[PDB]
Structure formats: C-alpha cells, structure tokens
From Swiss-Prot, chain A:
Record note on disruption phenotype: Morpholino knockdown in the whole cochlea, especially in hair cells and spiral ganglion neurons causes a dose-dependent hearing loss.
One family name in Pfam for this protein: ATP-synt_VA_C
The organism's taxonomic lineage, starting at the top: Eukaryota, Metazoa, Chordata, Craniata, Vertebrata
The encoding gene: Atp6v1b2
GO terms, biological process: ATP metabolic process; synaptic vesicle lumen acidification
InterPro entries: ATP-synt_VA_C, ATPase_a/bsu_AS, ATPase_F1/V1/A1_a/bsu_N, ATPase_F1/V1/A1_a/bsu_nucl-bd, ATPase_V1-cplx_bsu, P-loop_NTPase, V-ATPase_su_B/beta
Disulphide bonds in the chain: none
Protein name in UniProt: V-type proton ATPase subunit B, brain isoform
Entry annotated with the keyword DNA repair: no
Curated annotation (Swiss-Prot), chain B:
Intracellular or extracellular location(s): Melanosome; Cytoplasmic vesicle, Clathrin-coated vesicle membrane
GO BP terms: synaptic vesicle lumen acidification
Name this protein carries in UniProt: V-type proton ATPase subunit G 2
Family stated for the protein in its record: Belongs to the V-ATPase G subunit family.
Gene: Atp6v1g2
GO CC terms of this entry: clathrin-coated vesicle membrane; extrinsic component of synaptic vesicle membrane; melanosome; synaptic vesicle membrane; vacuolar proton-transporting V-type ATPase complex; vacuolar proton-transporting V-type ATPase, V1 domain
Segments traversing the membrane: none
Keywords, ordered alphabetically: Cytoplasmic vesicle, Hydrogen ion transport, Ion transport, Membrane, Transport
Phylogenetic classification of the source organism: Eukaryota, Metazoa, Chordata, Craniata, Vertebrata
Swiss-Prot record, chain C:
One GO term of the biological process aspect: intracellular iron ion homeostasis
Activity control note: ATP hydrolysis occurs at the interface between the nucleotide-binding domains of subunits A and B. ATP hydrolysis triggers a conformational change in the subunits D and F, which induces a shift of subunit d. The c-ring is subsequently rotated and results in a continuous proton translocation across the membrane.
Modified-residue entries (Phosphoserine), positions: S368
Disulfide bond sites: none
Function: Catalytic subunit of the V1 complex of vacuolar(H+)-ATPase (V-ATPase), a multisubunit enzyme composed of a peripheral complex (V1) that hydrolyzes ATP and a membrane integral complex (V0) that translocates protons. V-ATPase is responsible for acidifying and maintaining the pH of intracellular compartments and in some cell types, is targeted to the plasma membrane, where it is responsible for acidifying the extracellular environment.
Keyword Cell membrane: no
Subunit structure: V-ATPase is a heteromultimeric enzyme made up of two complexes: the ATP-hydrolytic V1 complex and the proton translocation V0 complex. The V1 complex consists of three catalytic AB heterodimers that form a heterohexamer, three peripheral stalks each consisting of EG heterodimers, one central rotor including subunits D and F, and the regulatory subunits C and H. The proton translocation complex V0 consists of the proton transport subunit a, a ring of proteolipid subunits c9c'', rotary subunit d, subunits e and f, and the accessory subunits ATP6AP1/Ac45 and ATP6AP2/PRR.
Organism: Mus musculus (Mouse)
UniProt main location, coarse: cytoplasm
UniProt xrefs under InterPro entries: ATP-synt_VA_C, ATP-synth_a_Xtn, ATP_synth_asu-like_sf, ATPase_a/bsu_AS, ATPase_F1/V1/A1_a/bsu_N, ATPase_F1/V1/A1_a/bsu_N_sf, ATPase_F1/V1/A1_a/bsu_nucl-bd, ATPase_F1/V1_b/a_C
Protein name: V-type proton ATPase catalytic subunit A
EC number in record: 7.1.2.2
C-alpha cells in the first residue's frame, strides 16, 4: 500500500563500535530497518535505534566492518521490521536472520507481522489446567508441567540437558486418557554445531519432521543477530497458534549467549549498569521474550515454552538464573552432583518447583491423593537429606531407628524413583504406585503430611 | 536388499504423486494468472501525488 | 498550542516549539495521540515520559497540549471493574474492539456514560441551606453489599439552589448546584481529581482495631493493625503473591484493592477466575466477593513508565474510598519493578546514579508513597471515620537484603516480615523466619486482646522463649551430637519441633484449613503450653527425687496423645461449629491431665 518511493543517503558522519551515525537524514523514522551497500558490493542490514534532529544512529545486525564514510550507501524502508510468516515453513531450516540453509527458496510469506509483537489483553486470558504427559517420573508427579506454561531448565556445561530436551519433545502426550501432536519449534543461540546435529538427528528419530520449524545460529556467526532470532521464532509461534488453531511446543536454548549479546550492545550504548554489570532493561527484554505464551478465549491452541539456559559457575544467585526465576513460574535445575554419581535422568527434585499444581491436579483429573503424596515425599526427602548431613559427622552409632529408616527411604528414592532410563515411557498411575510403594516403608504414624481419611484408605496394602 | 528394493518402489510412487501435484499447481496458475497480472498492472499504473504528511512551511 | 517532535529514545521523547509548557502537565503525541507527561524543560525544548511504547512516532509529529495534570475519575461503577496503569476499563475495550489485543493508545472514557443508576437524596438538605465541602448528600447503590456515597468535593461550599429528586439519572445528568458568592456552578456524580495531590483530612488518629490475618502465624506472633504498614521482602520461588491472595480473599475489611506492577497475567487469571466463585455474607443474603474488590492489572509487557502512574492511581482510589468512611486494605505487588522503572527513566534522561544505579530520590519518593495511610477522621457533618493500610511487597535482587530499596522499605515501614529461601525449600508454607521479623503494634493491641480474650500474654512470652531457646540450641546440638544434654533440653527441642510442624506449618489450600479463627489459634497454643509445662514440672520433680522421667518413657506413654495433638489441626471449621471445637479442646486437655495423673 505504501506508494512512497524509497530513499538513500550517503552522509555517514561517523562510526563508533557497532554504531553508525547518519547526518542530513530527512525526517527519520524511528525503529526503522535499513540496508547497506558495502563498496565491494556485499549486502548488510540493520535497524535504526536513535534519532535526534537531522541525525540518526543505527546499529548493524551483522556487525560493523569495512564501512567507509565516503563510499558506502544506506537506504531507508520507512516501516518497522516485519518478518515473513508461513504455515508451510514446517520441516525447513534457516539461519538466524531467516534466510534458507537447505537450498530452499524465499518463503512465501502468508503475512508480515511485527517482530516486536504486541501485548495481549488481560481480560482475554484463560487459565490452563491440562496436565501434559512427559514420561519422566520426576516431572509427572513432582513438577508436572501443564499446557500454557513456560518452565525452563537450569543446566551447566557438560550436563545432559540436551537429552532431557530430546525426551520431553519425544514423549509428549496428554495425561487425561482424536489424535494429538505438537508442532515443535526450536531455535539455536550460537551453540556449537555438534548439539545442532544431535537435535536434528533426534528430530528425524521422532519421525515427524513435517512438524519441525527449525532455526540455527553458530558461534562463529555474528553475535548481534542473536538478539533478533528468538523474536522471529516467537512470531512464528504466534502465527501458528492464533491463526491456524495448532498447539506449539516452543523450545529455546542457551539464553546465556542472548544475555551476553544484549550486554555487549548495552556496553556499546553505555547505559546505566546493574548487578554484575548487566543492562537495566534486561528484565523487560526477558519479559517480552517469555510472557508471549498461554492460550486465549475463542481458541483451542496454546503456547508452551521450555527456554533452557546455561548456568555459569553453578551459582544460584547469578543474575540470569535469578531474573529468569522471577519472570517464570517453575524450574527444574538438573544437578551436577547426580550426573557425577552416574545416574540418569539427573534432576534434583528438591530445588525444583512448579506453580500449576493449584489446578492441574486434583480430583476429576488424576486422583484425590496426588497432592498429599507429593507433599509427603518432599518432606521425607528433605528430612532424609538433613539426617544424612547429621550422619556425615555424628556416626551411625549415636543415631536412632528413625534415622536409619530415613536413610533407607532416601536410598530407595534415589535408586528407584529417579532412575527412569532413556526410552521407557511411564504412566501417571505407575509413578503414583511406585511412590506409594516407596512410602510404605514408614508406618502410618510418622506420616505428618497425609490426612487421616486418605491414609486409612490407601496405605494398608 | 529387500529394503533397498522397497525404497525404490516407494520412491517411484512418491515421484508419481509429486508430478501429479505439479500438474495441479500449473492448472491452478493458468486458471487466473492473466487476471492476476492485470491486477498487478492496474496497481503499478497509479501515482497518487502526496507531500509528506507533517511537513510545514 | 502545538509542538513538533525532535527526537526519541525508547520511553522518552524530546520535543520543540513548546514554550508554553509546565511539568506534570498531560500531553498527547503522534497520530496515535499517546498520553505523556513533561519531566524536563529548557529553552523552548522539553521532554516527555510516554506511557506507551514509541515505535511509530517520527520527528515532526504534532504535540497537543492540555491544561490539567494527570487525573482520574471517581464515582459509581468503578467497583468490580479492571483498570490498567492509566485507568482504561478493559471490559469496554474488549467490547469495542472485539479483539484480544490493546491498540496503541485508545481514547475510551474511564466511566461509561450510558448506564442509568438510581439515586437517593440526603433527606435533610433543602434549597437555600448552607453546606461545606466534604458533606455527604447522595447515596447510590452500586450493588447490595456497598452503598456508594458522594460528598461535595473540597474547595467547594455555599448554599444549594437545586437537588435532583429521587429517581434514575446517568453521569451526564446534572444533580447538584451551589453558589457561594453569587455564581451558580453545577456538579455531577463523577469527580476529576489529580493523582499526585494528597486528599485533605481533618486530623490523624492512632490504631485501635487489629487487622485480621488468615494464617495463625503473622496474627498471634507478628500482628498488623487495621491501618498500618507492612513489608514482605522475599526472594523468588516462595511466590508470596499467594500470601497476598490469601490476604485479599479473607479479611475483616470492607473494600480490597489489588494493584499489579510488572507481574504476569496469570496472577490476574487466578484472581478473576476465583473471586466470582467465592461468596460470603455479613447480615443476610450472600454475595460474591467480586462485588467488594477492585483490580488494577499491569503486566510487565506493558510500558515501563506506566507502572509509576499505576501505583499512584491505586493510592488515589484507596484515598477516595478512605473519604467514604470505611476500612480499605490494599496490597501492592513488586515495588522493585517501580524502582527499576524509575532507574530506567532516569538513566535514559542521563542523570548521575547515586547508589546501585538507582536514582538519588528513591527514598523520599517511597517514603511519600507509604506516607499516604493511617486511620484518620473524615471531614464531614455525618462525621465518618476512615482507615487505610498498605501491604507492600519487596523483591530482593537475588535474595540479598543489603539492597538500598530493602533498607529504605525497612526504615520507613512499621511492621516487617521475613521470607527465607530454605523455609520455602522445605515446603513449609508460609516461610516466616520469626527471627528477623518483628512488629511494633503488640503494645497497642494489648488493650484489645485483654478486653476481648483476657489471656494471650503468657502464651506469647513462653512461645518466644521456646523459639529463642531452640534457635540457640540448634547448632549446639549439631556440634555436640545430642550426647550430654539434660532432659530439659530434650523436652524443649521436641516441643519446639511440635510447635514448628503443627502450629507454624499451615497449608492454606487444603479445604479444612484455608482459614483459621483467633479463638482456635489461642486454644491450640493453650493446649501446647499446658502440655509443655506439665511435662516440665513432672520431669523436674521426678529427676529431683528419684526415678527420673526420661523422654523415651514419657514418649512411650503419650505417643497416642501427641499424635492427637499433631492431628488436631484437622478440624474444618466450616463443617465444625466453634462450640464443638472448644468442647473437643477441653476433652483433649482433660485427657492429657488424666494421663499425667496416671503417671503420678
């Protein structure tokens, strides 16, 4: 509809770091996109960040290099960045900027949507309470994830978080038992290409590449396009959810690289720092990345996020894990100690927490004794850890029978409940039965987290 | 050996299917591509002069 | 009269040709006429913090001026509606657009001008009598629970010339008209009020009545007064928002106002889904609690600067209902988000950070924001009596409590509550630390507690002593392996464990204990203290004379009784009348006495 011929100015009044200043620019358009013609002919791209008077500062997605103040040219679009969306993109592969990788064509773009998206009306929200079938006992039963929720996984270097992602995207299901399937979405964030190859291979292992919207980005690629890639993936998810009536299992990876790129941009822009030197608006940026989820009235679709992140130095008070914990409801926190104990799946059950037990579980969905079983198991595990710490110094001689019972319960809990294996999908009922069998070792009297009625009803077996 | 034989069979089948869909798409094109390019010419013919909206003297 | 844009930088816009400017004056910018407020002026230039994300304003765009500062509307229909930071009723937008998105800067009226409401006159005011600002003259029934009251706005007086007779009238219909010097001036049912200006009052008054708290903890240990100030700093994971939900759900107050600062829409989702279901009665018919609550939703996706506005509108609404002659308990969530937003607007405006990157005036702003509170006497002939309390929630940066905001909130507030990460890790709901937490209102409430219950002090003092002794002996027993401990130490630590796992532990989501009354709490604590005291004297005398009563043998004797004392919380007061509960408590007490006589 825009019948305005395009413009191009050569007045480059400077370059400082990843920023470029354009003087004599006529009527700047804020939050614009521009294209750059290097003297040798290579194409480049960027977005206008700041405007003041007849000046316009502009940051370059792929990074400043080779730009000449007298030879290069810059042309102006007049419209905010809009990305091509398409339902046929499933089963394809692209780089961070969206261009094809598999010798595929320029996508035929069902519409052009805002990269920055738009918020969602508050009143137009419906709470999700459908339990998802993950097949992991440590998730189904303890930290059960429901539709329309965004639980991440806090992992460090060398941990098998990639295999956890593989399992959760493979054994997805519905606890409440036509056909079902999840439109996978995944975007890399500069991760080394070996993990990308492994994810690709596992995605053919699923056998449903026709429902795999994939994006890629490697370490050697320019750092600053990582700021764009997740937003493009989220726009695709929005299009496939609220326009095609489909469920999408959006998953990300390596948010630490995203934080680092945003940090570098902020340092180039010399904003006011915060904790550990991070940007002040990193929180609002993360909010724009994550809160784009859920399901709304009039639509059967839903958005589920699993934005796994790296956790430097295994420090919980590190800012990135902290702020990610604030903005979200739940966490998993795969453990280094368990992986060094040679146990799989190594998920620490205690630090993990899910906030959707309030409606996901209960009578009419799973059972009338799920919540009290989980609470009792949590309490028993915590006190088992405490008495283990006591035994670490005091010695078995001075202990009491209760201490030995708690240690044996902890041993049973670790050898049986957590040990689940790589390809053994398990039902909710089996996990509940296993938990009841584990709990059977303690007589009924010391169970201080179970009501009388349920305890009389179910225990004597 | 049986696997590669069946793979050849299935490859031939899906190739036939893809050719069928190619025929379908070209039929869909020739249905109305003339009217479509006519619409394109109608669009590009316009000029509509307009000064910048918020310019002031 | 108009200005033109010069430059923009996210949430701030420098303008030009605006010599006629005054700070804290509303403005509109762009073809989308986004609302803003002046913050800096120099020469002909200026700057405007914009309450909407600014991707779509270019240079040269028109800048319309108005003459009034930020303001809000007060009247019937506000109760039971949802508003955003700058007072847009979400239901009206969802009806108009028939969509699921917010268009950028929609111009909707705060209060609908198409619904008629019954009206009642004062019945004692006649044409020609003189009236002063602050006097109720009309009553409109928003719903069966609340009878809205309207009073003459301040800076207004004189003799009335006309009052609307009884009947149905809308907002546009003029109702009242007064003259004081010889000029007639009309008045409708809607009040325009600046948000940053304190509403005048007559005089201030102390606290006399206790604010009801659902949890047994924070009521018998760290109480709060109906009109005071509370703080609840706590790291992530605990999700103290649920504690805020419990406070809003059950409370002896009259009106509850919840405001949001940068949380998720899911919190709204629970509260809006649940409140229509919940229902309660006071003097007859039963009505949903949604009719007695107002919401101000603001998710983090919303614009940054809008949050400051949102908090200020919240305090304004609670102030207006304070003038109504009621008690209104508000809880504000995530003030740290407000602090961050202020940091960000300052940093973009390029001031010099004072401490932790935050501005140099966060302390005074927070102090003034908290200062709008207390129990006062209204200014009117019907001589109302209003009250307002605040429950601010603090978000430590990483759980560290040395942050400047936490120290300021501690220094301004009167009641401080502690949240500990390990307690929330224990699933020990709620995670009250009982070590750094304190209150400063027990002395004021002693008069009430003596007048109405006549025994709380010995219970409280002994409980505090036991908790302190257990805290002292925790690491001691850790570092000596419970080897050379006297019987007194063992009874103290085990009764402390009983108090911890029964009296302090309270799952507020199981149906039988979603709510607990004060009488049951003091009955529990009376039973526990009596058990502890009788055990103490028994073991003391037996150790002194002969046949020392060690913990093992008394435990064997009273395993059944301590099991009942553990399981006694299973009452379900909705299904169990108070008389039966106290009868069972006396029955348990005499059982314990009978067992103790059986021993000796």
């Amino acid at each position: 509809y825009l019948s305005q011929p395009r413009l191009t100015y050569k007045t480059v009044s400077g370059v400082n770091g990843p920023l470029v200043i354009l003087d004599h620019v006529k009527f700047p358009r804020y939050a614009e996109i521009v294209h750059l013609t290097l003297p040798d002919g290579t194409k480049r791209s960027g977005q206008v960040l700041e405007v003041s008077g007849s000046k316009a500062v502009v940051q370059v997605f792929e990074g400043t290099s080779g730009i000449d103040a007298k030879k290069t040219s810059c042309e102006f679009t007049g419209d905010i960045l809009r990305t091509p969306v398409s339902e046929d993109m499933l089963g394809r592969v692209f780089n961070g900027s969206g261009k094809p990788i598999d010798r595929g064509p320029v996508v035929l773009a069902e519409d052009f949507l805002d990269i920055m998206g738009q918020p969602i009306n508050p009143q137009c929200r419906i709470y999700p309470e459908e339990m998802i079938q993950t097949g992991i006992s440590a998730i189904d039963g303890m930290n059960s994830i429901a539709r329309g929720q965004k639980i991440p996984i806090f992992s460090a270097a060398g941990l098998p978080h990639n295999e956890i992602a593989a399992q959760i995207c493979r054994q997805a299901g519905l606890v409440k038992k036509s056909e079902e399937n999840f439109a996978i979405v995944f975007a890399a964030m500069g991760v080394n290409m070996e993990t990308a190859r492994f994810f690709k291979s596992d995605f053919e292992e699923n056998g449903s590449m026709d429902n795999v919207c994939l994006f890629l980005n490697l370490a050697n690629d320019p750092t600053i396009e990582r700021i764009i890639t997740p937003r493009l993936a989220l726009t695709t998810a929005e299009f496939l959810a609220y326009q095609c009536e489909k469920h999408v299992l959006v998953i990300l990876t390596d948010m630490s690289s995203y934080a680092e790129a945003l940090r570098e941009v902020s340092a180039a822009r010399e904003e006011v720092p915060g904790r550990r030197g991070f940007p002040g608006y990193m929180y609002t940026d993360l909010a724009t990345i994550y809160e784009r989820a859920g399901r709304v009235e009039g639509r059967n679709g839903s958005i589920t996020q699993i934005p796994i992140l790296t956790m430097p130095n295994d420090d919980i008070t590190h800012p990135i894990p902290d702020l990610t914990g604030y903005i979200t409801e739940g966490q998993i926190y795969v453990d280094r100690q368990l992986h060094n104990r040679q146990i799989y799946p190594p998920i620490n059950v205690l630090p993990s927490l899910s906030r959707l037990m309030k409606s996901a579980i209960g009578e009419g969905m799973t059972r009338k004794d799920h919540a009290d079983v989980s609470n009792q198991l949590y309490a028993c595990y915590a006190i088992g850890k405490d008495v283990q710490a006591m035994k670490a110094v005091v010695g078995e001689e001075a202990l009491t029978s209760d201490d030995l019972l708690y240690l044996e319960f902890l041993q049973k809990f670790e050898k049986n409940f957590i040990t689940q294996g790589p390809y053994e999908n398990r039902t909710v009922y089996e996990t509940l039965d296993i938990g009841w069998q584990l709990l059977r070792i303690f007589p009924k009297e010391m169970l201080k987290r179970i009501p009388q009625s349920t305890l009389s009803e179910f225990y004597p077996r | 050996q049986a696997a590669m034989g069946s793979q050849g069979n299935l490859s031939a089948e899906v190739e036939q299917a893809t050719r069928r869909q190619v025929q379908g798409m070209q039929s869909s094109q020739q249905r109305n591509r003339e009217r479509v390019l006519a619409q394109l010419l109608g669009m590009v013919c316009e000029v509509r002069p307009q000064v910048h909206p918020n310019y002031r003297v | 009269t108009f200005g033109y844009v010069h430059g923009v930088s996210g949430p701030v816009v420098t303008a030009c040709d605006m010599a006629g400017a005054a700070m804290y004056e509303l403005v509109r910018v762009g073809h989308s006429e986004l609302v803003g407020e002046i913050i800096r002026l120099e020469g002909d230039m200026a700057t405007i913090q914009v309450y909407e994300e600014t991707s779509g304003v270019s240079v040269g765009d028109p800048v319309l001026r108005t003459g009034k500062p930020l303001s809000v509307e007060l009247g019937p229909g506000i109760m039971g509606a949802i508003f955003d930071g700058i007072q847009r009723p979400l239901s009206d937008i969802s009806s108009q657009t028939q969509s699921i998105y917010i268009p950028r800067g929609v111009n909707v009226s705060a209060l609908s001008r198409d619904i008629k409401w019954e009206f009642i006159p004062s019945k004692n005011l006649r044409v020609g009598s003189h009236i002063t600002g602050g006097d109720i003259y009309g009553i409109v029934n928003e719903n069966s629970l609340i009878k809205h009251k309207i009073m003459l706005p301040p800076r207004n007086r004189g003799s009335v010339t006309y009052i609307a007779p009884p009947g149905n009238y809308d907002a546009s219909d003029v109702v009242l008209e007064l003259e004081f010097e010889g000029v007639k001036e009309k008045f409708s049912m809607v009040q325009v009020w600046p948000v940053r200006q304190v509403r005048p009052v007559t005089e201030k008054l102390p606290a006399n009545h206790p604010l009801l708290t659902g949890q047994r903890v924070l009521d018998a240990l760290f109480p709060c007064v109906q009109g005071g100030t509370t703080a609840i700093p706590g790291a992530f994971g605990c999700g103290k928002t649920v504690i805020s939900q419990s406070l809003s759900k059950y409370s002896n107050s009259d009106v509850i106002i919840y405001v949001g600062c940068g949380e998720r829409g899911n919190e709204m989702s629970e509260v809006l889904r649940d409140f229509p279901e919940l229902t309660m009665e006071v003097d007859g018919k039963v009505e949903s609690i949604m009719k007695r609550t107002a919401l101000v939703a603001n998710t983090s996706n919303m614009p940054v600067a809008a949050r400051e506005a949102s908090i200020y509108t919240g305090i304004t609404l609670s102030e207006y209902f304070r003038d109504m002659g009621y008690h209104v308990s508000m809880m504000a969530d995530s003030t740290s988000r407000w602090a961050e937003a202020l940091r960000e607007i300052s940093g973009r405006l390029a001031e010099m950070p004072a401490d932790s990157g935050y501005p140099a005036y966060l302390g005074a702003r927070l102090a003034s924001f908290y200062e709008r509170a207390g129990r006062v006497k209204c200014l009117g002939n019907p001589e109302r009596e209003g009250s307002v309390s605040i429950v601010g929630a603090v978000s430590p940066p990483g759980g560290d409590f040395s942050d400047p905001v936490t120290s300021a909130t501690l220094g301004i507030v009167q009641v401080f509550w502690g949240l500990d990460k390990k307690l929330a890790q224990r699933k020990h709901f709620p995670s009250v630390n009982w070590l750094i937490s304190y209150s400063k209102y027990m002395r004021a409430l002693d008069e009430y507690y003596d007048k109405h219950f006549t025994e709380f002090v010995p219970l409280r003092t002994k409980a505090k002593e036991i908790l302190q002794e257990e805290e002292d002996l925790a690491e001691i027993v850790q570092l000596v392996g419970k080897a050379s401990l006297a019987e007194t130490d063992k009874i103290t630590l085990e009764v402390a464990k009983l108090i911890k796992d029964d009296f302090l532990q309270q799952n507020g989501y199981t149906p039988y204990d979603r709510f607990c009354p004060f009488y049951k709490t003091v009955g529990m604590l009376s039973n526990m203290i009596s058990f502890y005291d009788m055990a103490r004297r028994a073991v003391e005398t037996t150790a002194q004379s002969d046949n020392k009563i060690t913990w093992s043998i008394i435990r064997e004797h009273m395993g059944e009784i301590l099991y009942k004392l553990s399981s006694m919380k299973f009452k379900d007061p909705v299904k169990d009348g108070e008389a039966k509960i106290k009868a069972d408590y006396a029955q348990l007490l005499e059982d314990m006495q009978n067992a103790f006589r059986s021993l000796e």
